[PDB]
Amino acid sequence: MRECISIHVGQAGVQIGNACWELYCLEHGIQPDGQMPSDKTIGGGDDSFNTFFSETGAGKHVPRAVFVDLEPTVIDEVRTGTYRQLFHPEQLITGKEDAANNYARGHYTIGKEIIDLVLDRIRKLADQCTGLQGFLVFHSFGGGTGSGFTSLLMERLSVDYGKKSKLEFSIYPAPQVSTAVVEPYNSILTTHTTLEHSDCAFMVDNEAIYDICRRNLDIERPTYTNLNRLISQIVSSITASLRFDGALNVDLTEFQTNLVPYPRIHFPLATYAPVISAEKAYHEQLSVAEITNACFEPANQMVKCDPRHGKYMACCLLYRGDVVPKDVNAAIATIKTKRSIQFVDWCPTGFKVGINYQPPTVVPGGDLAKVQRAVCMLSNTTAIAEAWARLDHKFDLMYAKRAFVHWYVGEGMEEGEFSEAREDMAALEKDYEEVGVDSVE
Amino acid sequence: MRECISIHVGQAGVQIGNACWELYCLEHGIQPDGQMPSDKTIGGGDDSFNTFFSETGAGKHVPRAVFVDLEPTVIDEVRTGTYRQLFHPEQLITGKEDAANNYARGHYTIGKEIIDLVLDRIRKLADQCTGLQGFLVFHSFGGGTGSGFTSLLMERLSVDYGKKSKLEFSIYPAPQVSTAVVEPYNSILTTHTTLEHSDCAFMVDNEAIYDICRRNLDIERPTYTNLNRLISQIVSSITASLRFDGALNVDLTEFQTNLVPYPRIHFPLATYAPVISAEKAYHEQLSVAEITNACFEPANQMVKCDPRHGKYMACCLLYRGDVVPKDVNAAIATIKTKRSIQFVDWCPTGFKVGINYQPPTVVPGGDLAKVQRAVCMLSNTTAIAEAWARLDHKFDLMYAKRAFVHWYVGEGMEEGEFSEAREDMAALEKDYEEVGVDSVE
Amino acid sequence: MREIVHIQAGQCGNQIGAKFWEVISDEHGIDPTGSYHGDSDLQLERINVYYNEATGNKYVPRAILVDLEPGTMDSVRSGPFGQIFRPDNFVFGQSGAGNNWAKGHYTEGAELVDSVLDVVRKESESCDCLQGFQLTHSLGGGTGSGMGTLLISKIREEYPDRIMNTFSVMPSPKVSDTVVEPYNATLSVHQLVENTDETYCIDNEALYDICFRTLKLTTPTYGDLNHLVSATMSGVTTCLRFPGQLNADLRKLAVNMVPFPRLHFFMPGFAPLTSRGSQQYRALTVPELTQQMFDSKNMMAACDPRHGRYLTVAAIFRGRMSMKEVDEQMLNVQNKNSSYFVEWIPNNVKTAVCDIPPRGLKMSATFIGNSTAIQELFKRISEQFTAMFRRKAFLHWYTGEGMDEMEFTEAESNMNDLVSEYQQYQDAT
Amino acid sequence: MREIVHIQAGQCGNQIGAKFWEVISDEHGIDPTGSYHGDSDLQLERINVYYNEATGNKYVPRAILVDLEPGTMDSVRSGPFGQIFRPDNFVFGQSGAGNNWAKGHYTEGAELVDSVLDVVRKESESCDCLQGFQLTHSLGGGTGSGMGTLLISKIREEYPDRIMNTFSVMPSPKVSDTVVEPYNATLSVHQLVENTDETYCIDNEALYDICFRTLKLTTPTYGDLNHLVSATMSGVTTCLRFPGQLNADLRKLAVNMVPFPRLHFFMPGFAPLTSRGSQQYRALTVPELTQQMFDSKNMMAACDPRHGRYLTVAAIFRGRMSMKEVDEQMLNVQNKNSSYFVEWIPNNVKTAVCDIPPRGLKMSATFIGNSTAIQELFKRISEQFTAMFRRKAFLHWYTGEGMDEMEFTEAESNMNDLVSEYQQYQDAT
Numbered sequence A, B: 001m002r003e004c005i006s007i008h009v010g011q012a013g014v015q016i017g018n019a020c021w022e023l024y025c026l027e028h029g030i031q032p033d034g035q036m037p038s039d040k041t042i043g044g045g046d047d048s049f050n051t052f053f054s055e056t057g058a059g060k061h062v063p064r065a066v067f068v069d070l071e072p073t074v075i076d077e078v079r080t081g082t083y084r085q086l087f088h089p090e091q092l093i094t095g096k097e098d099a100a101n102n103y104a105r106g107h108y109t110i111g112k113e114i115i116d117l118v119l120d121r122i123r124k125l126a127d128q129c130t131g132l133q134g135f136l137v138f139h140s141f142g143g144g145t146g147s148g149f150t151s152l153l154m155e156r157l158s159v160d161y162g163k164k165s166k167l168e169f170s171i172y173p174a175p176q177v178s179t180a181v182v183e184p185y186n187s188i189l190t191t192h193t194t195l196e197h198s199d200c201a202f203m204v205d206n207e208a209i210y211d212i213c214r215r216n217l218d219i220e221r222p223t224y225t226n227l228n229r230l231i232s233q234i235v236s237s238i239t240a241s242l243r244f245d246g247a248l249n250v251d252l253t254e255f256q257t258n259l260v261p262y263p264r265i266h267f268p269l270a271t272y273a274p275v276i277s278a279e280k281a282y283h284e285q286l287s288v289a290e291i292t293n294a295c296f297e298p299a300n301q302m303v304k305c306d307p308r309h310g311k312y313m314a315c316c317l318l319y320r321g322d323v324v325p326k327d328v329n330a331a332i333a334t335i336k337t338k339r340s341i342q343f344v345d346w347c348p349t350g351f352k353v354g355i356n357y358q359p360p361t362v363v364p365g366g367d368l369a370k371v372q373r374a375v376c377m378l379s380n381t382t383a384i385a386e387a388w389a390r391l392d393h394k395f396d397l398m399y400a401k402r403a404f405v406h407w408y409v410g411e412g413m414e415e416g417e418f419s420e421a422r423e424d425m426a427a428l429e430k431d432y433e434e435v436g437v438d439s440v441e
Numbered sequence C, D: 001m002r003e004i005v006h007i008q009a010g011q012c013g014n015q016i017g018a019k020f021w022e023v024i025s026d027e028h029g030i031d032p033t034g035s036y037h038g039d040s041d042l043q044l045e046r047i048n049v050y051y052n053e054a055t056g057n058k059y060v061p062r063a064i065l066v067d068l069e070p071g072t073m074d075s076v077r078s079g080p081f082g083q084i085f086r087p088d089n090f091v092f093g094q095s096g097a098g099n100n101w102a103k104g105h106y107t108e109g110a111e112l113v114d115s116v117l118d119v120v121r122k123e124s125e126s127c128d129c130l131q132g133f134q135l136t137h138s139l140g141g142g143t144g145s146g147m148g149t150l151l152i153s154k155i156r157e158e159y160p161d162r163i164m165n166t167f168s169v170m171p172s173p174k175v176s177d178t179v180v181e182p183y184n185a186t187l188s189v190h191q192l193v194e195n196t197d198e199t200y201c202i203d204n205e206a207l208y209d210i211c212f213r214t215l216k217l218t219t220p221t222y223g224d225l226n227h228l229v230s231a232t233m234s235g236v237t238t239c240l241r242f243p244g245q246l247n248a249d250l251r252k253l254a255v256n257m258v259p260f261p262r263l264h265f266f267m268p269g270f271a272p273l274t275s276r277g278s279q280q281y282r283a284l285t286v287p288e289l290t291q292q293m294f295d296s297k298n299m300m301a302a303c304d305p306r307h308g309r310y311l312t313v314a315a316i317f318r319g320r321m322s323m324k325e326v327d328e329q330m331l332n333v334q335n336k337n338s339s340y341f342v343e344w345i346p347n348n349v350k351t352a353v354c355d356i357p358p359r360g361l362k363m364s365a366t367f368i369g370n371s372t373a374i375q376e377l378f379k380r381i382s383e384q385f386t387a388m389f390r391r392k393a394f395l396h397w398y399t400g401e402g403m404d405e406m407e408f409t410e411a412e413s414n415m416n417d418l419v420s421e422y423q424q425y426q427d428a429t
């Protein structure tokens, strides 16, 4: 059984998961009290709730997910909220003080105190698995728990397990919008485990999502609650071919085989094409052809980036619903035709399509409309180096005067560690300079 | 008929028995006024009340148990309480002053005055037996009656009877928690009869039970009343295959044959796996496989101990309820697989399973939930030597200055007896050093 | 003529035989009460092989139930088939065996065996012309091992020429549910060597393996594994009870299964075994059944025949079948697999063919193999034995009961000598 | 006689064969449940070429379904035709292949192939006189490519003289839906060279082109393209199953299709293909069908024959037809187009004529071509291969799984050598 583990770390990581685990409840037809209703005398793990829901006896569905925070407060929104009996009580693990936007606290001081209790929750879910697929860590670069703790966990998960996929859903720091002033300190130090221990790190940021809500979608005033329903449709599609039938299904490992060229070039941005408001959902031509072109739009990116500034290296089309493939292959051939879209010269064969039959669900009270088709495009590009150049420069400014150093050293790390994680990220940005360039003879 | 004798000595020994004889009343369907209700026109000693209940004429069930105390006060909680007509009047034997945390008083001074009246109660129950199995002494090491009197009785029970099993349910002194300061004096002196006269001594202690209530069970604030319902499920399962049908039944003597290697290596700790609170009883996977693994947990121990510090020598699985054996044999083979679990090198064949069909009863107002399966694991390990090293050191501290010696000598024992019972326990702890070690050639 | 006395002994012995006399009692159309409700007069011609007819056409088996514990007897009495036995054949003590060999063979066994051999003589003095006996018991129990081998070693003094065979369950190291089952199995292998004519070694793991892989069961109990075993025990003496084209008694097997004395440890096998649903997808034929009887995954002994050579086999078919296909399939096997057979014996296979299949299908078969690969059993025990005994663990519960050490060392050597008897007869030309 | 074992492998393999045994199961009037519901006794004379008759006139194919992923098997079971297979032939692992060649050929393939060759021997030991095998698989998948070529290279060690052919789907650069399909196709072309008797190279673009232009379909799925392909695979072995005027087995083609060893890569073709509606406007005749079989737009391989020369072709007609018109049309072609044929072979065409058309029309035909123009396939791959491999992209997912570089460089050279084998046999007199 294609089972998978969600881990939701820190405030952002928890609050995304609300929006994730809201959705799968609708995907598999599960009430917020964990119950499938009486109109499901059909095949459950044939609808495959069984990758995200261990079926407790007597018709009861509890996730394979763990909600971890160093602060009591965030998870206590999940107790009560409405999800107060969806979750297993023992998978909502609270500390007492958060890392408090301090990587040294989340990794050394506070994080170690709950790390074995969290790893022991993993084993209780790891031993219930048959054919474990991998882990889905959610966090934010630029928290304390999202960076400090996640770094501590990913070390321990690499040692105990090794073999499985470990996906990350990070939130990257936005170039203008930021709310912590040590936001770049906590991102340089999380660089270390993100490239080494994760197998595929995704990056999103809040400004590139603000664009999409306002422009494609005509929401006046987004909150985090609005953005995370969007986040969840990207992840819901990723992991949908594990758990629904379709031609050209794609396991969690078939991403990495088809998306990732080299060891540490594993930072693909996602998109999602049918972000359409109810009114704008008429005046649609929402065919396969238009929605494939919309993925390649530099405005429909989930990262503050412009693929017109770099070259794509792989793409990866994951479609849901009322789909005929030859419409897709004719829309690929258009994509190969255009010269505004630069692939690299060593790719040649562009990219991997994957289709699934299960259409998305419209989240109730949600922002989307009812669409028939839907497409994430996970896509390596050299344009995500530009996100890095805009953030190294913020780190290099503050660390030039050794600003907030005294908080960090007095918590269980060294001054020396800044100089290593800065070199470490400077080497990544040098890899994408050398991976964009073709070789000639 | 598979009959058995409970003897409940001292304050702790009585107050456990309340929680034991509460339970069997529910096991066999007996009201607190000793009556089976009208809906039992089925086979009584076929449900085999007849190991713990001599059926008085006219449908009335009185135990084969004797409640002994040197103090009037404890048993007077049983007269009245609610059990005031469950018990035979003549099996509630009171002294007038307790031994008063003084072994010399419980064994020589006060104990001899009631010892023949207690042995004569045994004969009145011994002669009513057909196929007497053995005795179940309950007490605490570190009382006066629990140590001094129990030592006196076990001498007399070995002489009159010899042949039968004599189980003990001791409470061992906890390393931090203690309430008597001569607690180690009374434990060194009870060492003598525990290894010599008992056939199988169990040890529990209060801290290792505090853990389980708080952690597995989410009780905020345990009392003795809470702990002893737990104690009683361990004993209720031990003696359940005598008195219910199941495949692989296990008599009282089949423990000792399968649990006990050598003459004095007969100190097995028990566990119990489904200690689950009502809320945490959903979010269960409470299969046979998980509940077998839970026995081998160093946290689910009934002794302040960590089997990761010693090697198991035998184990002994006693299961109740909705059980398919092949699930068990596949869970054994997992246990043999792991290298965190050290058996010894002369065991090879690990351990003995036993199954019973009768599911536990949820004690009303009790702490457990409704579980379908349940497992005690009686298990010899070399890790119980560690409980001893932590208590000899407390004895050796106080006896270095000959502290409370003047109370003991002036009551009917010698200074010389401390030096013999210290050597006696030092030899046990030397046996487990020499029984953990394999022989090589 | 050719009666069989059944001595089911111990807990395990009683469970199998409970299910055993539920099959035989279906073979001959015996009511639960003990009346006859068949239609075919084949069921009665040879009913007397197992059943005493009593007054007014009730049919009481010739089985004797022995125990050292009242429990199993009360279960059987109170069940569906309590009515079928004679109540003077429920012979039982009160004090349990301890899963201790000494306790069932010397102390508490010897006390009872007088009151049981007196029941053996009720049965043996009533028969026309007795053929054989049979224990159903367990090497690894107290009464199955100890009391069983006391009953055996006291029947050879009375009835020294009847085919006495056992269906003995042998321990497997993968599935352990008793700590001293090496002690209890070693001291009874010692007795089965010198005293028995045929020994059908059965394991536990080999029966799950049939349930999981072949039958596609989910959740096996003792109830299910012995339901298999009873379909083997029915097959053994089929041609004793039904007419056939080749007949084959107990004695007929014994004679040409057993090259040397002492090597009388057989590996059964049954075929067919399908799941329900997967029955309309196998065509049921003699080459279909032959392939199951020689596949390793249909052995009720937890060994692989490929770790040795069959000395001899017997093939007992039950059904309206041909003789060429039988004589050919049994030929094409000992040609294609000629290195899996001992070559100093021509025609390793004996066929027997009955006419009467079990009461649900056509064309069953039963494989009974004298393979050299059974020393894999005796060594896995004599490694556990020698690992506990070097410490002298669990010794006082044995020396306490009338035994001593020198019974152990000799019994260990009698097991380890016959490992060097299967070994000699595997290799060396 | 002349049985065919079917090994459908991978995801693609299972989809085609799902639709393949929906055609064959119509050729012989097999019910979805597995009973027979025909009327003509032609359907049964040679049913045994594909179907084991089982107990009580049910017909179980001789197909084995292999996968490294439970999904396709559960789909097929739960569909219209789940009932038809034997449930012991649904052999599958749990961990997916990765669309990785190494993962299906070394790590997770080798683990399973033991449990599959044991199913090959269930099938091969039941046949009267086996003719051949067949994979249905995909060069560009994990299990289709990797596990397929592990199964093949282990059958040549067992059954070294049976016609083993593949219907392999080959990648096209116009339609890409996997990034490393050059890696996965290169390492399996290497195995198909030395191990296979005939190889029917099929593409994707060539099947849309038939749907769009000829059939006038709107919206093709895998469901529709393999429905075509299965009408080719039926045609191949028609004269093996039906009586004809010229017969032609698997072996008959093989022999005179293949000049040199190693050049066993064929281009199928089917005719007729009309839309519905445009059927009453074509007169259906032998010159009508011949013109479709030689037109480039009816090739199921995405090439143009005009970029080379046919070495040899075979023409397999199915229907009540003449022999002069056949013998003439096949003559008038290799005269008018004599520069499109290799001239060192006289009579490039082999005709076979069956008597039994498909179950909707008269007079079908099947073109199977050994053209030199198939090096257009091998070069379009060995350009993508050499463009990724010069960077060593996607390498750690391969060297991680037991492979190394030197398996690549040799496998690239084995593909690039046979480009220089079609090249030699196109030109040079």
Ligand SMILES: CC(=O)O[C@H]1C(=O)[C@@]2(C)[C@H]([C@H](OC(=O)c3ccccc3)[C@]3(O)C[C@H](OC(=O)[C@H](O)[C@@H](NC(=O)c4ccccc4)c4ccccc4)C(C)=C1C3(C)C)[C@]1(OC(C)=O)CO[C@@H]1C[C@@H]2O
Pocket: C022, C023, C026, C215, C224, C225, C227, C228, C230, C231, C232, C234, C235, C272, C273, C274, C275, C276, C279, C357, C358, C359, C360, C361
């Ligand atoms: C339509 C049909 O043919 O059904 C068969 C059947 O499907 C199969 C699968 C049966 C079936 O057996 C089981 O499923 C099974 C259940 C528990 C324990 C062991 C097996 C069957 O239940 C059992 C049943 O057996 C008999 O009736 C024999 O007489 C058998 N008798 C019993 O053990 C028995 C069963 C139930 C009640 C009372 C007695 C026997 C075999 C050898 C020697 C003496 C007697 C049969 C043939 C079948 C069913 C009914 C489905 C099989 O078993 C036996 C012992 O025959 C399992 O593998 C064999 C092959 C059979 O073909």
Ligand SMILES: CC(=O)O[C@H]1C(=O)[C@@]2(C)[C@H]([C@H](OC(=O)c3ccccc3)[C@]3(O)C[C@H](OC(=O)[C@H](O)[C@@H](NC(=O)c4ccccc4)c4ccccc4)C(C)=C1C3(C)C)[C@]1(OC(C)=O)CO[C@@H]1C[C@@H]2O
Pocket: D023, D026, D027, D215, D224, D225, D227, D228, D230, D231, D232, D234, D235, D272, D273, D274, D275, D276, D279, D357, D358, D359, D360, D361
């Ligand atoms: C009235 C009439 O003559 O109609 C024809 C028809 O119009 C044509 C266009 C058919 C038709 O086929 C298709 O349109 C088609 C659909 C999906 C994929 C591939 C083709 C036909 O559907 C398919 C159908 O095929 C058969 O019945 C064969 O036995 C065929 N069987 C199947 O594949 C099958 C399909 C659907 C339902 C049941 C069976 C076969 C072919 C080769 C080997 C074995 C079996 C036929 C002759 C026709 C229709 C019905 C319109 C054609 O195809 C076949 C496979 O024969 C397409 O080009 C040919 C030429 C036929 O003349």
Ligand SMILES: Nc1nc2c(ncn2[C@@H]2O[C@H](COP(=O)(O)OP(=O)(O)O)[C@@H](O)[C@H]2O)c(=O)[nH]1
Pocket: C008, C009, C010, C011, C012, C013, C014, C068, C069, C096, C097, C098, C099, C136, C137, C138, C139, C140, C141, C142, C143, C144, C145, C168, C169
């Ligand atoms: N198949 C099988 N039979 C057993 C096993 N253990 C004991 N037996 C049988 O049970 C009988 C021996 O009794 P035992 O179970 O020791 O008796 P008790 O333990 O006092 O009730 C014999 O007939 C044995 O063949 C076992 O593990 N498997």
Ligand SMILES: Nc1nc2c(ncn2[C@@H]2O[C@H](COP(=O)(O)OP(=O)(O)O)[C@@H](O)[C@H]2O)c(=O)[nH]1
Pocket: A248, A249, A250, A251, A254, D009, D010, D011, D012, D013, D068, D069, D071, D096, D097, D098, D099, D137, D138, D139, D140, D141, D142, D143, D144, D145, D169, D177, D178
């Ligand atoms: N023709 C073809 N077959 C494919 C393609 N991708 C995978 N396959 C086939 O699918 C099988 C692998 O199964 P896969 O799709 O990986 O299974 P998953 O775990 O469900 O993704 C192999 O037999 C492949 O040859 C493709 O692009 N084309």
